[PDB]
Structure formats: C-alpha cells, structure tokens
C-alpha cells in the first residue's frame, strides 16, 4: 500500500532539524525519500548511507553540503538534499518502485520493519539535548 | 505543542529551547537570549 509507505517518508521540512545531529547514519538509513529527477516524474530510492559533496548550497534559511547515496534498484549515483520533494508516494510511482525492486531482486522490506523503523524518527525528534552535541552542532 | 521558542542574543536567530536543556544558541554559541512577544490581545488606548 502507498499510504503505509508514506509514514517513513522524510520530507524536506523534517531534514532541516537534523543537519548536524549525530547518529545520522542510523536513524536515516532505512527510510525512503521522493527524490526529484526531472518532467514531473519521480523515482523512490533506498537510503544506503551518507556521503559528503564538495559543493556548498543553501536550502532556504540553513545551508548544508552533505550528500545522500541513494539507489533505485540498480541505478545509483550521488544526490542532494535540495532536490527532495514534499509530495507523497503516488500510486503510479508506488507501482514503478515495486517493479524496480522486483526487477533488481532486492527483497521488499517487511511491514514490521517499517512499523518499527517509523518510531525511530519520532523518538529522535523528542530527544533531549543533554549530552555534548550542541558544541559539535555550532562548530 | 509549544517548545518555548527563544531569540538569540547577538545572532537574533530563533531557537527551540525546552526544559532541562542548556541555554545556548543553535549556531556559534552564546549564553544570552531573550523571549518573543506574547500572543495575547495587546490593546492600548491612545490616551
């Protein structure tokens, strides 16, 4: 279903609150994003890890140069956090992603996996900043 | 769902400070910050 898959969709507004929070390669790795390719067609890709690009770009108020190593079945390349769209996974895009996953051979994540992963972002959002992370963030 | 937003001292940049947290700005890092104007009906009489 597309509705259950949009629960872990990391929109463009949520990523602005974890630009310098540690454990970025643990809570983010697992969710899906609607990266814009470009005309209005979109392709859902899996978050394999985290990379850092040499180009610095501004995204509204803040500004980040980090990348996002994505993959859609087999075709993989470097992307940016500015091309991500806030739209939800449509039926056509959902079917396209399902077909790509079936063709690539990657087993579809189980429903319980998404159910237990969606809570990660929720528990990270309300995380108290009591440790020594503000110093690294400001640096 | 009000996280008690604040305004930094010199940066004048909004910050979300909750209870049991240090009083510092999201960037640079200072120790001074003020609050934002209330949302009440501030009505005066031009007398």
């Amino acid at each position: 279903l597309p509705e259950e898959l949009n629960r872990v969709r990391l929109s463009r507004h949520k990523l602005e609150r974890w630009c310098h929070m540690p454990f970025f390669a643990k809570t983010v790795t697992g969710c899906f994003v609607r990266i814009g390719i470009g005309k209005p067609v979109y392709r859902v890709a899996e978050i394999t890890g985290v990379v850092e690009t040499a180009k610095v770009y501004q995204l509204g108020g803040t500004r980040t140069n980090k990348g996002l190593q994505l993959r859609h079945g087999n075709d993989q390349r470097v992307f940016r956090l500015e091309f991500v769209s806030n739209q939800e996974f449509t039926e056509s895009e959902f079917m396209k992603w399902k077909e790509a996953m079936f063709s690539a051979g990657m087993q579809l994540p189980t429903l319980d996996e998404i159910n237990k992963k969606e809570l990660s972002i929720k528990e990270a959002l309300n995380y108290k900043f009591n440790d020594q992370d503000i110093e690294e963030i400001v640096k | 769902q009000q996280p008690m937003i604040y305004i930094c001292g010199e940066c004048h940049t909004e910050n979300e400070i909750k209870s049991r947290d240090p009083i510092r700005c999201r960037e640079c890092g200072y120790r001074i910050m003020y609050k934002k104007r209330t949302k009440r009906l501030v009505v005066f009489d031009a007398r």
Binding site: S11, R12, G36, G38, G60, F79, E82, F83, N86 | -
Partner: peptide
Amino acid sequence: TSTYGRYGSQTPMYGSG
C-alpha cells in the same frame, strides 16, 4: 510544527541543473 508545507516552495530537479 512538524512540517508546515502548505505544494511547497518550488522543489528543484536533478536534470534541470
């Protein structure tokens, strides 16, 4: 205050660049 999108703020594309 999770995501005040209200659509969005004109999202750029990859091939457009």
